[PDB]
């Protein structure tokens, strides 16, 4: 219980890939993430890009320690694998939908574990790639993750949208529909 | 399903009443279980699962490791709060308020910070259904308030720290 | 003014 909660930061490393994630959060929102392959800090706001600076080397050094720590605890826990959780998907608009005026469709994918997910958009059954953005795996108090995917569009009576989510916790790929 | 071994390290800061109260909690998690942690209020590493004692005892025996973590209240928490005061804590985004029939819903979208007060007033009415505060994830919030409900005009009053005076939107 | 960050403590090898 506090006025402001910050994570400086969320350090993630998993055997599948292997893959990792470094990010800083403040009051439940992602400030920046470090692209581990590009060794680059990516701020999630123009205000942050102009004012704030973080050295990606510290993120990469942290993941190297996590890799060491994971291999030590794997041997300790007698090789205990991660339990796959069933994710919760919620689809909604950013602003009030009006025919002709540009809007954004938000796809909240909550309770993600392990942090390996495929979030894609389908317009009238056919796949869409243009104007698609995504957040990183945002942390939860119960040490699970949530990811939010976006779709910029032009609302019309001809287009119907679906948020396709693929996860190991699911038998069949989950599809949450949206209608204007 | 493929086999996966997940490791997480969360270095968290807890701020209360500006710079008066500062607390840090570092969490070491295997898969989903937090086996060891460091609470600035405790001052030492503590095992929180029988998977934690070899880690917690080793880190506490090393003086250089213990002192670095203790100092992380200043080198991380207090250092970054000063960077938040000039950026995040000064971010004020005015909300977009539009009344559309669905019942008349008051759409209060794209605002930051979370602090919001929306009331329907004609005099103030009681018996309104308000959805929980929605996080858009793009550093903006949205909230929708619906009311039960000739010649009378309905006004939606919205209070936010970004506005000196509330935005009044009528529906004749 | 560069951002500060927490360091993970190394597990005993």
């Amino acid at each position, epitope marked *: 219980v506090a006025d402001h909660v910050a994570s400086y930061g969320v350090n993630l490393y998993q055997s599948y890939g292997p893959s990792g994630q470094y990010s800083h959060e403040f009051d439940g929102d992602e400030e920046f993430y470090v692209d581990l392959e590009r060794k680059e800090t990516v701020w999630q706001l123009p205000l942050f890009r102009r004012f704030r600076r973080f050295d990606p080397q510290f993120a990469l050094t942290n993941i190297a320690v996590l890799k060491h720590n994971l291999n030590i605890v794997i041997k300790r826990s007698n090789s205990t694998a991660a339990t796959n959780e069933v994710p919760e998907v919620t689809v909604f608009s950013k602003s009030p939908v009006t025919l002709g005026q540009p809007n954004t469709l938000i796809c909240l994918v909550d309770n993600i574990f392990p942090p390996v997910v495929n979030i894609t958009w389908l317009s009238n059954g056919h796949s869409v790639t243009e104007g698609v953005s995504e957040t990183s795996f945002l942390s939860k108090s119960d040490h699970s993750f949530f990811k939010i995917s976006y779709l910029t569009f032009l609302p019309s009576a001809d287009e119907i949208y679906d948020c396709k989510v693929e996860h190991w916790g699911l038998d069949e790929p989950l599809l949450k529909h949206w209608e204007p | 399903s493929p086999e996966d071994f997940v490791y997480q390290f969360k270095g968290m800061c807890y701020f209360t009443n500006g710079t008066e109260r500062v607390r840090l909690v570092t969490r070491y998690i295997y898969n989903r279980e937090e086996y060891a942690r460091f609470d600035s209020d405790v001052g030492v590493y503590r095992a929180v699962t029988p998977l934690g004692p070899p880690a917690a005892e080793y880190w506490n025996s090393q003086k250089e490791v213990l002192e670095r973590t203790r100092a992380e209240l200043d*080198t991380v928490c*207090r250092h970054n709060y*000063q960077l938040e005061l000039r950026t995040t804590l000064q971010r004020r985004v005015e909300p977009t308020v539009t009344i559309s029939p669905s019942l008349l819903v008051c759409s209060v979208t794209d605002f930051y910070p979370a602090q919001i007060k929306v009331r329907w007033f004609q005099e103030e009415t009681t018996g309104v259904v308000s959805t929980p505060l929605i996080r858009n994830g793009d550093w903006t919030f949205q909230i929708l308030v619906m009311l039960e409900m000739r010649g009378d005009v309905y006004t939606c009053h919205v209070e936010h720290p970004s506005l000196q005076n509330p935005i009044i939107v009528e529906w004749r | 003014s560069g951002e500060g960050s927490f*360091q993970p403590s*190394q597990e005993n*090898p």
Partner: T-cell receptor, first 114, second 109 residues
Framework: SGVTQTPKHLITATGQRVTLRCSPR?????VYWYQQSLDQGLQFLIQ???????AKGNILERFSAQQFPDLHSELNLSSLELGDSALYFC?????????????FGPGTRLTVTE | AKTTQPNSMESNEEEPVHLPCNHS???????IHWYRQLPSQGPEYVIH???SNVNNRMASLAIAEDRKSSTLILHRATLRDAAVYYC???????????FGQGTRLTINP
């Protein structure tokens, strides 16, 4: 200190290639290389942690290093120049975490001659 | 140079020495490290700190309230403590050590 280096001394001709060995302290995961020349003083070259490169200095392309599975390190100096005549110090720390002090080896004294 | 130190310092054996260091451009994430190098030897760690007075088995470190300066205190320097003392700024998360000119300490028998 606990850190050992081989050879202690080296006398090489210009254009030759040379390999410097280093053993960190027992338990130390991070290994480091430094050059101590009369012209530039003590200069950081490279750092390895658990066999992977973590930090780099103003290390020339001629210079290259490696950390092996037994955590021991090797520094390779190719196309040797008279200016490469320096003290090459090895160092090690328990880990890469910034609180860990560095323990230095006795150094390799290299003299490059025409 | 991130740190500035006097070039040389002379002292008597079995007497305290106060080695000063200026570092006005320090950051809230930087530590103050002190290393030394004895003649024909590899560098050796002395002490490191963040704020105020720091002590260990080898020395004391007095960091100024504004953190823009510090002092290394060798409580009883012997003839074996004659070395070059380097005052180094290093980020609390970094390992790379940047050695400047330093102070060459001469101990008089």
């Amino acid at each position: 200190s606990g850190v050992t280096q081989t050879p202690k001394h080296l006398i090489t001709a210009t254009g030759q290639r040379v390999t410097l060995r280093c053993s960190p302290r027992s338990g130390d995961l991070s290994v480091y290389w430094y050059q101590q020349s009369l012209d530039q003083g003590l200069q950081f070259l490279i750092q390895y942690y658990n066999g992977e490169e973590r930090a780099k200095g103003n290390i020339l392309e001629r210079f290259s290093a490696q950390q092996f599975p037994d955590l021991h390190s090797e520094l390779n100096l190719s196309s040797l120049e008279l200016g490469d005549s320096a003290l090459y110090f090895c160092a090690s720390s328990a880990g890469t975490s910034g609180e860990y002090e560095q323990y230095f080896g006795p150094g390799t004294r290299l003299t490059v001659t025409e | 140079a991130k740190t500035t130190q006097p070039n040389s310092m002379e002292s008597n054996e079995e007497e305290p020495v106060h080695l000063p260091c200026n570092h006005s451009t320090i950051s809230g994430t930087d530590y103050i490290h002190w290393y030394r190098q004895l003649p024909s030897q590899g560098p050796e760690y002395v002490i490191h700190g963040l704020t105020s007075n720091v002590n260990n088995r080898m020395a004391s470190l007095a960091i100024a309230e504004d953190r823009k300066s510090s002092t290394l205190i060798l409580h009883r320097a012997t003839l074996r403590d004659a070395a070059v003392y380097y005052c180094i700024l290093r980020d609390s998360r970094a390992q790379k050590l940047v050695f400047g000119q330093g102070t060459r300490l001469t101990i008089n028998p």
